Amino acid sequence: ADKELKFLVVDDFSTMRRIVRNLLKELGFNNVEEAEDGVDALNKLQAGGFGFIISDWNMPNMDGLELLKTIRADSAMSALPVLMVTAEAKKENIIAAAQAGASGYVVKPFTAATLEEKLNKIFEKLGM
């Protein structure tokens, strides 16, 4: 996948966003912006050019599942890769992610190696 792919990292906890941005940087992905919930995310996305979303599940105003469904049903953004992040792997939450079109699913905390594994899975499926 292109090193200059533009990521949006979405989490209501600024420290978690910083950590994810830093892991991306460690992998060579320097083109990264941040959003603090699903509403903030959609605002940022209007600027265009975004190529990959990493979103937390639990956020105020619009949560990660709500954001994912919105992106997937959007006329312009429907095929954007979205990696969902959760605090705990549960059947119900995984199946919810699957039904909504999550490109990937990862439990926090995760290492740069795990992030790379999940990104590569998504890139492979999408032919990126």
């Binding site: 549960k90 059947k91 995984i94 699957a98 990937g104 699913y105 999940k118 899975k121 499926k125």
Partner: peptide, 14 residues
């Protein structure tokens, strides 16, 4: 059930 979670994740390509 943890095995069911791992199977589920694998089946989804997650």
């Amino acid at each position: 059930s943890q095995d069911q979670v791992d199977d589920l994740l694998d089946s989804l390509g997650f």
